[PDB]
């Protein structure tokens, strides 16, 4: 037969494989109109019908992210200096840092940074109106692809931390409880268990106060996060999670107790010995209108304070003891108002069975208070909008509402608003929900706050800097003060008050506090993990250090790196005066190793830099100064001489005398098998011998990867007396040419260049091979790793490969010295998680991937699965039909009485130290002959995760075994039995873990070419 | 002094540098509220107040892209199989292919693909309602980051092509015009010079028809693209560009005669000897309403058909000889309707000076059918929206409209719309514009179409597949047929018609046409460029070939690659029967070299694959069949033996006898400072080449490994042994990474074992490029076949410039499919063609010089706007808007300047370089470090108008450089100071291409010695 020709059944497999076209394509406009419907993904502008949402409380947030989407967006963030997003965040979250942590896969460190400044970090990630806050200042708004999804990233990192089930711990910088001064036992009262008081109590507990009580009127906690924000924006289990974190700090909550004249008052708190009080009761009553006087819910009238708590109580499992039904909202619903509550009333009314929802407001579209995020949810769910209408009267017939009369409004010459009595609208309605806002009106509650001063907005008056009322022991914040318009601002109000409550209480006990307010961070048991390591008789407080490179150009830079937390640092390589050099410019350029992607996260750099231009006297004086000031931080002096015994001996002794803990020998010098000393084992052995005879401190040989066998050079260094090797220096390369042939870097008028050194993540596979091969050949010989280390996650790969410490250059060039805090918290988390048996199915900090579309979990419904319903076109309609019917079956098949007491996971094995993980990977490395060819695998695709791109199919067709069927109608792939398990399809799929490799169960025959 | 500390002025420079935080930050809610306005980038929700737009016709499209943004978005596209976006494009554009070309920087190839199926490809890129077309089907809608900006990408590639100023050429597949059959001289008439006729005439001219005339009623051409679509969405020079492309094919346009009685009729056309006619006159008249009878423009009334051409004539330079005054539209403007025209009237009215615009429509918001893109523009410019109002009276006093009276509208149960006479609105207004649609209604125009059949909507009937009317020689398309609602569907109507006009005319002359419609592609002189090359006596039709790898697993795949256009291919390496191998699985994994980015454009792969599992008998028979079927495509047999003379001679003779054009010796076989493999030892390579040279007479090439100290010594030994060239290079040995539990990937068997693998792809391109350059400089003229990260025409040309003659590809096909060859070939043709064009020297290949821009739109060149430290946020942005608006007004009150350049194509001034002409031309720039000038230093300089204020340059200079950048605390604008050393890190990390540039240093230079 013709061996080079596909047989008919493979030709059939290949039907949808791309082919080069020779002509333009003929398709009529009518046929194109009909075919469009089959592939449609987004909403249809001609669709006017609301799709059925009765009893559907699934997440509708557009900002929710899964891990795949979160990694992409975190990598996109510029991680800006003095970032304007943080300036625009009311709690001043270090967004730069927590997004950096997410991009490095350090979800713990991200969450810790979030909760350090915002104890309701998950709630806020979900509900913050970011377009009017952090995102509104994001620099990437100045790009076509637009601003960063900061809230979704905050939500993702916080959701992972939640799933870790790690508790908050008492501030570890505090003295033991025993030894705390008496002032910290002062009895503190907080009124209302909403965002403001939860924040305030949390920060007070961080400061060490041990007697903190929140008194809550209702039987549920969380405030408006619980009672009014819909479950389809903020799941109730988020609120519970954040309350439990605060309770870890000892805060007490007592429900069923009210600030009111016949219960708790300021006077009764004083009588009972309370020393300070925080008022955080919000705005508990609806703003009402005479037009609705006497109307009952049974007639069809609600305020938002009546309606939204009913929906919350029904839809939020564990909010109440009583299971309760969803309000029977049938027919046409009129929502009055255009604030943000109005849009939650409209979307919630659809969940209660509304046939039609009209949002009617008394000003125009350009006057809507609502953030666009909030408006869009109502728009996409087909609520109707009626502007310029002021309500005049509700029509009641047969005991129920049947219509609302309105008068038109308009804006005149001044700008101020008139009503037009002659221009009426009679709007039919079965239900009316007023969303006019909220107030504090209850005279009993107001009198319980005697004698604090109220302002003309009729709210407690506070100093906006201290949150103190006119009574010095009473503070207030959140909605009740009338500035905060958001959860995060109410959180910040409690945070602000906490410092000044602390100051007031301390002064009452005769103690002063710092002139600069200084609140503690958020802490968990992860932060107590020991990440120190000893290597070559040297103690490293953590394994991360600055490589000898541009980040160590000046010793003042090393000083700042030590102040940031870096465990050790190399000097830039320096030499004797005779060997003075002069750099050229340009000399450091970005890598082209991952295409025309600019900005953060360059996959490599190339440099034609020389050794340090600063003198040996500068570096030796600097080493003395750094070791004087930072005795616990390791300083390694990097030195270079030509192939001359007397020179190496003189320079090494000079660096030793300066106080260096160790030396690093840079073997890049040309000599008299490559042109460099480091490429010849005999020269390396001699250089190490000369230094070993000259000094008594340890020294390490820095190996080049540009050699046939780096184990040869490493053994030469050991034979010469080196105490270890640094693996590796940069890979020799040329990073590319402009289209006119000239290079980059191009030096001088001649536009000349020379071969440079490639650094960064593009050389990590080369460095990782070098470290592992040296570690297997020379067991126990200390290795300092360098080559693309840019995270705790990747640092741990080099530790597992045999290195003891981790040098970094390019990751700092891509960012700044503060990445050390990400690396340290990330490594602590990785080691801590190894002790948690309940998380053993995770890959480091990553939860096992389950079925999702757009990071939202696929509903596991019998009638959604197995049956070839992709997420587009008519298949998507059928999917939505199936989900809707199952929500209705869910409305009766009704349960909410098996929640889950949230108890943290406890380590059930010792937490490994660094020395316990070094080299653990080497057991899996060997020769090719040690790999099983009997245990073969095949690919299997999770159809529910697939996004129908066909990349697996095209890679198997033109780089594989033509083993994947690609359906022409559903665009769903299926791996057939001809799969060889090569794993290319998995490697190109855009969805993490959509494709998995599983043990082959059918007989396996290698394809030998037989007909 | 303390050398390791920053002096005072450096400490202040470092003021905004990121530092690690040990405490939570205290910032009051009130202070946060006041600071938020300073940084604000996006629209303020509280802004009731549209900024001023009078006489401002600058681009407002949200989809416009510059090069930086286009490359990012094109790399994001999954480049899907059987792509649904193409299914959803009415002209069936190969979106996958043209976006692939953009990602590979081949803007010519992308434009050629666009214009092959859409002769108005630039217009459609700007105006297509993609959310209802191609983008509505995009698979990436199923990700959080969302669908691809297809239209903006189409616009960008077409804009670059426009700037190339290259003409369209006659279809080069046609015989010369002297020897075309008589039928192609048939006189063809088209009526109306809009998108439908322009498309129809273009495709007819592509087919070879030489007598094609478009008869246009007006003095201007382009149809609605000219007369009504606003300049701030579609610049007139786009329309002119596409018209001139069509005139390149010989289509004639005659303005001033109409299809109408007493003018042109179907009867006059027939009598004058026209053989076919296409009706593309659109809907030339406004849909009227009796309530507007007698109202005049002087009173303030317009239909859309009166208003929008008035604005076009004034704002589009080159439409008229008349410098037209913009309609003075002061006061309140009421636009009636909510179709897409209504929104263009609203935005255009602002440009005329309207103070407020109301969009008033008779149904609800759910019932608006305008695409969301178009609604968003009116919404963001603060137009008001009034639903459920039907106009009843226009009130005129003092000779001017002063108000419009409406009645409320309402739906029933039946869904039947009613008007409530008792519910009235009296809206004050100075101008009324009706946007009720367009119609064909002039009795003499319809009478000129006698006797074709019209339908119940008074439109000509066509067969929807052929576009033929009831008269066989008359065809129709576009708006006039009533099916197209878009420019692209109108283009498609003309495209569809062109084939059946062709079929009809050919039949009239007694000739048949193929049953499969075959419209020709779009061609330019670039497509005639020769990209063949000769090497080692072998003739390659193009320099691109498949490497010996997974894309050549089977000879059936090589066959399909040749059919796609690949110039050559390697077999997978094969061996004698006794050397049979068995692969393990998994064995090919994605690279980790550019972080957790999944899907397209993987920056590397790692493989632990062996040689072919298929027999030498399979491969030799396959080579015979491939060479019999594709004699002009080069087939190179890759072979491997152990270090054995008899084996190498036997296998190489077997492959030679099969008809292989050449052999490639895989030097990966183990044997025994010269490692394990034969390719790492020059003595072994020399002997192997000696053996093969004795055995065969065809050329052979030694495939070098990069895993060697000195690859030149290996290449020299191969040449001494008799090889005719070398292939540089094989994969780089590496370990791609470990999971957090220490297990490797790939992991084989239950033991999860691995071995060192080979790294391929763009991550190893700097290594391969250094290898090719160093061999080319040491062994000038010795043929080099390059392999290692070649993924585009421009990377291919880097390797040619470096001394290679042909270009092997693997990973780029694994990342995609075989059809990338068409991108590579057109891209290489374009790169060589542009080298002959003097007017484009300043480009870098296909990339224009970057002008100052924000979000890809050029910054206004205004004096008071330059150098005034006004970044694009907060109060500075408001000042920029004032300055821009002010001299839009000064450009108004002086109404001169109507000189739109007449478009002439650039002409090559020297011959087009052939492949052999460019080989090695980069080597002149390579040298030793000592040959680099250290006198000619550079410094960095920042273009503040392109800056997006991220501080990355600042952060990198601070912690990886010389603390030489000032970063302003209020404007977040950086300035390079005189302590710059030209190191070039800041440029290397800046997210904006060419925002930072290196320039010659003009101030005295001293190296920093620290001392
Ligand atoms: C001195 C030096 C400069 N650049 C590098 O990449 N490595 C080195 O050792
Ligand atoms: C046989 C072979 C497999 N994989 C590679 O990367 N190179 C080779 O030569
Ligand atoms: S022509 Fe229009 S519909 Fe087709 S791909 Fe381009 S933008 Fe999309």
Curated annotation (Swiss-Prot), chain A:
GO biological process, one term: thymidine catabolic process
Subcellular location: Cytoplasm
PROSITE patterns to which the protein is assigned, alphabetical: 4FE4S_FER_1, 4FE4S_FER_2
Main localization (coarse): cytoplasm
Binding sites annotated in the UniProt record for NADP(+): 338-341, 362-363, 369, 435-437, 479-485
One CC-aspect GO term: cytosol
Binding site residues for [4Fe-4S] cluster 1: 77, 80, 85, 138
Record InterPro entries: 4Fe4S_Fe-S-bd (IPR017896), 4Fe4S_Fe_S_CS (IPR017900), Aldolase_TIM (IPR013785), Dihydroorotate_DH_cat (IPR005720), DPD_II (IPR028261), FAD/NAD-bd_sf (IPR036188), FAD/NAD-binding_dom (IPR023753), Helical_ferredxn (IPR009051)
Short name of one Pfam family: Fer4_21
Residues annotated with N6-acetyllysine modification: 382
List of residues binding [4Fe-4S] cluster 4: 979, 982, 985, 989
Active site as annotated: 669 (proton acceptor)
Function: Involved in pyrimidine base degradation. Catalyzes the reduction of uracil and thymine.
Quaternary structure and partners: Homodimer.
Protein name: Dihydropyrimidine dehydrogenase [NADP(+)]
The encoding gene: DPYD
């Amino acid at each position: 037969p013709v061996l080079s020709k596909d047989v008919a059944d493979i030709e059939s497999i290949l039907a949808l494989n791309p082919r080069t076209q020779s002509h333009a394509a003929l398709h009529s406009t009518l046929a194109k109109k009909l075919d469009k419907k089959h592939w449609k993904r987004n909403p249809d502008k001609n669709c006017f019908h609301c799709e059925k949402l009765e009893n559907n409380f699934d997440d509708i947030k557009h900002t929710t992210l899964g891990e795949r989407g979160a990694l992409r967006e975190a990598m996109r963030c510029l991680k800006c200096a003095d970032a304007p997003c943080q300036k625009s965040c009311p709690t001043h979250l270090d967004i730069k840092s927590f997004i950096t942590s997410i991009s490095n896969k350090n979800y713990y460190g991200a969450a810790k940074m979030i909760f350090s400044d915002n104890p309701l970090g998950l709630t806020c990630g979900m509900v913050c109106p970011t377009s009017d806050l952090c995102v509104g200042g994001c620099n990437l708004y100045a790009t076509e692809e637009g601003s960063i999804n900061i809230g979704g990233l905050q939500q993702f990192a916080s959701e992972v931390f939640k799933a870790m089930n790690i508790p908050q711990i008492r501030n570890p910088c505090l003295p033991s409880q025993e030894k705390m001064p008496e002032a910290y036992s002062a009895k503190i009262a907080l009124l209302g268990a909403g965002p403001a008081s939860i924040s305030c109590a949390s920060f007070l507990a961080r400061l060490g106060y041990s007697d903190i009580t929140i008194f809550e009127k209702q039987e549920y906690v969380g405030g408006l996060s619980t009672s009014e924000i819909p479950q389809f924006r903020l799941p109730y289990d988020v609120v519970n999670f954040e309350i439990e974190l605060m309770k870890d700090l000892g805060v007490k909550i007592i429900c069923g107790k009210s600030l009111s004249e016949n219960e708790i008052t300021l006077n009764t708190l004083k009588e009972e010995g309370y020393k300070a009080a925080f008022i955080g009761i919000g705005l508990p009553e609806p703003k009402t209108d005479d037009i609705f006087q006497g109307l009952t819910q049974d007639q069809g009238f609600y305020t938002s304070k009546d309606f939204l708590p009913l929906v919350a109580k029904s839809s939020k499992a564990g909010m109440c003891a009583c299971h309760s039904p969803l309000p029977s909202i049938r027919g046409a619903v009129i929502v009055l108002g255009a604030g943000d509550t109005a849009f939650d009333c409209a979307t919630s009314a659809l969940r209660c069975g509304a046939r039609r929802v009209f949002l009617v407001f008394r000003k125009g579209f350009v006057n809507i208070r609502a953030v666009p995020e909030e408006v869009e949810l109502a728009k996409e769910e087909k609520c109707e909008f009626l502007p310029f209408l002021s309500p005049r009267k509700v029509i009641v017939k047969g005991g129920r509402i049947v219509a609302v009369q309105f008068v038109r409004t308009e804006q005149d010459e001044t700008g101020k608003w008139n009503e037009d009595e002659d221009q009426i609208v009679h709007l039919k309605a079965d239900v009316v929900i007023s969303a006019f806002g909220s107030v504090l009106r209850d005279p009993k509650v107001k009198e319980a706050l005697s004698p604090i001063k109220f302002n003309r907005w009729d709210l407690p008056e506070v100093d906006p800097e201290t949150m103190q009322t006119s009574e010095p022991w009473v503070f207030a914040g959140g909605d009740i003060v009338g500035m905060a318009n958001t959860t995060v601002e109410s959180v910040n109000d409690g945070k602000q008050a906490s410092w000044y409550i602390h100051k007031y209480i301390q002064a009452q006990y005769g103690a002063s506090v710092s002139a600069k307010p200084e609140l503690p961070l958020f802490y968990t048991p992860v932060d107590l993990v020991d990440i120190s390591v000893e290597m070559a008789g040297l103690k490293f407080i953590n394994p991360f250090g600055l490589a000898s490179a541009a980040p160590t150009t000046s010793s003042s830079m090393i000083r700042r790196a030590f102040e940031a937390g870096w465990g050790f640092a190399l000097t830039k390589t320096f030499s004797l005066d005779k060997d003075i050099v002069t750099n050229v410019s340009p000399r450091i350029v970005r890598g082209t190793t991952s295409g025309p992607m600019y900005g953060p996260g360059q996959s490599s750099f190339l440099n034609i830099e020389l050794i340090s231009e600063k003198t040996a006297a500068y570096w030796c004086q600097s080493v003395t100064e750094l070791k004087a000031d930072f005795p616990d931080n390791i300083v390694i002096a990097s030195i270079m001489c030509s192939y001359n015994k007397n020179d190496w001996m003189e320079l090494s002794r000079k660096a030793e005398a300066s106080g260096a803990d160790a030396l690093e020998l840079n073997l890049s010098s040309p000599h008299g098998m490559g042109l460099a000393c480091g490429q010849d084992p005999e020269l390396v052995r001699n250089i190490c011998r000369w230094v070993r005879q000259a000094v008594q401190i340890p020294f390490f040989a820095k190996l080049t990867p540009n050699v046939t066998d780096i184990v040869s050079i490493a053994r030469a260094a050991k034979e010469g007396g080196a105490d270890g090797v640094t693996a590796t220096n940069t890979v020799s390369g040329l990073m590319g040419l402009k289209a006119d042939g000239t290079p980059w870097p191009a030096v001088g008028a001649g536009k000349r260049t020379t071969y440079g050194g490639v650094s960064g993540t593009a050389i990590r596979p080369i460095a990782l091979r070098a470290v592992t091969t040296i570690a297997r050949a020379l067991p126990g010989f200390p290795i300092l790793a360098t080559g693309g280390i840019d995270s705790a996650e990747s640092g741990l790969q080099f530790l597992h490969s045999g290195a003891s410490v981790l040098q970094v250059c390019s990751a700092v060039q891509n960012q700044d010295f503060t990445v050390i805090q990400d690396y340290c918290t990330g490594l602590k988390a990785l080691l801590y998680l190894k002790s948690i048996e309940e998380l053993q199915g995770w890959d480091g900090q990553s939860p096992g991937t389950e079925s999702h579309q757009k990071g939202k979990p696929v509903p596991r419904i019998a009638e959604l699965m197995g049956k070839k319903l992709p997420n587009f076109g008519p298949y998507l309609e059928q999917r939505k039909k199936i989900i809707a019917e199952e929500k209705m079956r869910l409305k009766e098949q009704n349960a909410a009485f098996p929640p889950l007491e949230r108890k943290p996971f406890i380590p059930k094995k010792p937490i490994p130290a660094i020395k316990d993980v070094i080299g653990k990977a080497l057991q899996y490395l060997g020769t090719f002959g040690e790999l099983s060819n009997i245990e073969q695998v095949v690919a299997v695709i999770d159809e529910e995760m697939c996004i129908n791109c066909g990349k697996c199919y095209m890679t198997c067709n033109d780089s594989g075994y033509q083993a994947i069927q690609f359906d022409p109608e559903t665009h769903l792939p299926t791996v057939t039995d001809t799969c060889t398990g090569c794993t290319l399809c998995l490697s190109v799929c855009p969805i993490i873990d959509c494709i998995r490799m599983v043990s082959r169960t059918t007989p396996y025959e290698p394809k030998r070419g037989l007909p």
